[PDB]
């Protein structure tokens, strides 16, 4: 019965609006930066100004995307969703965000968490059901109100640069199990979630951020692999489902005209009616709102015109259009103008039949009531809401329920004759050595906690930061010097230097510092009989590069610790697990590709250590 009023009272709504309203709710752009009059370059825009209220007066957007920039700090995030929903002159804001979790986040005093791939390796659903609740307690807190997560998109192709460990798994079960987790614990804080990024981003070994992928694979593999986990999802209630701006030539081959060189292009499936209705709409039976990935992103700013993308996008059935330009100052605001007259002249044509704008402004008002956002539930005052977010975000047992989820998702890939955990005796000297300095700062801060809180002996610490180095005499002393070694290393594509199965050890530059440095670290520590352990911190696929290790483990995310602050919680659990501070209990969520033996799997899909006994979990 509720579910009948809601679908009523939006079309009620809907039939009250004039035309620039119905299409102002179908776009939803950032204000990221702004230059305010008198100023010379965008700044972040952390604090409400009239110059931006004016254009939400103006063009009444249907919702806002924030950026890191623009949420800080919990206080004035809090003061900028209150501004711009007093902004938003007749329907509240959908105001979104990219909070995944762990290499995807946005808040700046926020739990981070150790992201999708960490979940994936932990393998309970349960664990990502808490993560969308607890990063939805604290959206909800700050007054956002929509997450563009999870990330359904399936890993399958390792040099995927763009979604890797922000992917759960390479098998599709293992991805839908935690993807629906992660939405219901979103939708139970009354939190919008949209999956992501339809028909699935996965196998792609080009980022849509910088040009256009191609997926290539038929019919049946996509709808056996891709769309699986967004179908289950779409069935269990799935509020929102972003595109993918990468195309699917099963699905539609129509071509266009690129603007970059002329040449024909395949269409992006954010601009194909084919994917967008034909598939999503009508054959997998998703009413909810269809949004396009960002609109400003090069897989299509490259090929389509600014007001041609919008158009296009809406034309193929997205109800909402996702940066449909970017306005830095007043100077630029009729972009939002030259859209939405494109929009009423599609209308006007008859090529996007006003009944089609109808329906798509439903489905944002339907989604709107469904969750809460409208009427507006909250009465508090500014100075209130602000206490009592600043008790939320970021809360002592947020951090505890990370911390439980990072340790646990450690990957354990060998450990031979205990090697780990580490059990240094007082005095000894232990080397961190990793890409870049905020990664060996975490791993410092870490172990210096360790030796404060009295888990360890006292141990002096050095840290070799090694991007963009070529190894040199000086660090190989440094590791004749050590008794302990911990090195991480960072890939996104695994590209080590490989000939018949030889990775080349020769390469006396720093051109491929990323392989070539940790695996010379490792020799020398190897030669020295040095305690050596080899952390992986980004995509785990750079575990097959060093199988001399005696210990490896695979953390699932690269992040730092910079101005007092962990950016995520990964580094800080493999460290913990190390030194016998925490318990790993990770499979693999993806299978590795053997380096040396191309074509054969090192480590498949399901394979992790105990730390303990050195056998299978
Ligand atoms: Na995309
Ligand atoms: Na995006």
């Not at 979790?101 to 994936?120: H, K, Q, S, Y």
């Not at 998109?153 to 992917?167: A, C, E, H, L």
Request: charged content about 25%; overall charge positive.
């Amino acid at each position: 019965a509720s579910a009948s009023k809601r679908a009523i009272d939006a079309n009620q709504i809907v039939n009250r609006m004039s035309l620039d309203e119905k299409l102002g709710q179908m776009l939803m752009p950032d204000f990221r930066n702004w230059q305010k009059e008198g100023e010379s370059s965008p700044q972040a825009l952390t604090k409400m100004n009239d110059e931006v209220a004016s254009l939400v007066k103006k063009y009444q957007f249907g919702g806002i995307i924030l950026f890191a920039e623009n949420v800080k700090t919990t206080k004035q995030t809090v003061q900028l969703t209150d501004d711009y929903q007093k902004a938003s002159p007749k329907i509240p804001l959908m105001l979104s965000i990219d909070q995944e979790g762990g290499i995807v986040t946005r808040l700046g005093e926020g739990t981070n968490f150790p992201g999708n791939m960490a979940l994936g390796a932990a393998r309970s659903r349960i664990n990502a059901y808490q993560t969308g609740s607890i990063i939805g307690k604290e959206l909800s807190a700050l007054g956002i109100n929509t997450d563009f997560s999870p990330v359904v998109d399936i890993n399958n192709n390792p040099d995927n640069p763009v979604i890797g460990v922000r992917s759960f798994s390479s098998n599709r079960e293992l991805t839908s199990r935690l993807g629906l987790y992660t939405m219901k614990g979103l939708q139970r804080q009354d939190i919008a979630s949209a999956l992501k990024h339809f028909p699935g981003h996965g196998d792609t070994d080009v980022d849509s951020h910088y040009g256009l992928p191609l997926v290539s694979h038929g019919q049946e593999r996509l709808r056996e692999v891709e769309l699986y986990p967004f179908q289950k999802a779409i069935d269990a209630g799935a509020d929102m489902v972003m595109t993918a701006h990468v195309q699917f030539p099963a699905f539609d081959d129509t071509t266009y005209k690129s603007k970059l060189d002329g040449s024909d292009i395949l269409v992006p499936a954010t601009l194909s009616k084919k994917v967008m209705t034909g598939l999503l709409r009508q054959e997998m039976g998703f009413n909810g709102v269809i949004v396009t990935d960002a609109l400003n992103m090069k897989a299509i700013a490259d090929h389509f015109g600014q007001e041609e993308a919008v158009v296009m996008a809406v034309k193929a059935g997205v109800d909402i259009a996702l940066m449909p330009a970017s306005v830095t100052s007043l100077k630029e605001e009729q972009k939002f103008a030259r859209v939405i007259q494109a929009l009423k002249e599609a209308v006007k044509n008859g090529d996007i039949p006003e009944q089609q704008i109808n329906n798509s402004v439903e489905r944002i008002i339907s989604l709107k009531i469904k969750r809460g956002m409208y009427p507006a539930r909250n009465s508090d005052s500014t100075k209130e809401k602000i206490a009592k977010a600043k008790k939320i975000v970021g809360s002592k047992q947020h951090l505890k329920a990370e911390k439980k989820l990072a340790e646990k998702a450690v990957t354990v890939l060998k450990n031979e004759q205990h090697t780990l955990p580490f059990k240094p005796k007082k005095g000894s000297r232990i080397l961190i050595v990793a890409p870049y300095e905020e990664q060996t700062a975490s791993i410092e801060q870490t172990i210096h906690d360790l030796i404060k809180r009295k888990k360890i002996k006292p141990v002096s610490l050095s840290k070799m930061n090694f991007a963009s180095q070529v190894f040199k005499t000086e660090h190989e002393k440094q590791v004749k010097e050590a008794d302990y070694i911990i090195t991480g290393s960072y890939v996104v594509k695994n590209d080590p230097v490989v000939n018949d199965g030889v990775i080349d050890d020769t390469i006396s530059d720093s051109s491929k510092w990323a392989t070539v440095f940790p695996r010379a670290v490792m020799k020398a520590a190897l030669q020295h009989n040095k305690p050596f352990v080899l952390m992986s911190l980004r995509n785990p696929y750079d575990a097959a590069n060093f199988e001399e290790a005696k210990a490896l483990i695979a953390v699932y995310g690269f992040k730092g610790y910079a101005n007092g602050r962990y950016l995520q919680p990964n580094i800080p659990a493999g460290v913990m697990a190390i030194f016998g501070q925490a318990k790993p209990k990770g499979t693999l969520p993806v299978d590795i590709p053997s380096v040396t033996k191309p074509g054969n799997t090192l480590y498949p899909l399901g394979y992790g250590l105990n730390i303990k006994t050195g056998r299978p979990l």
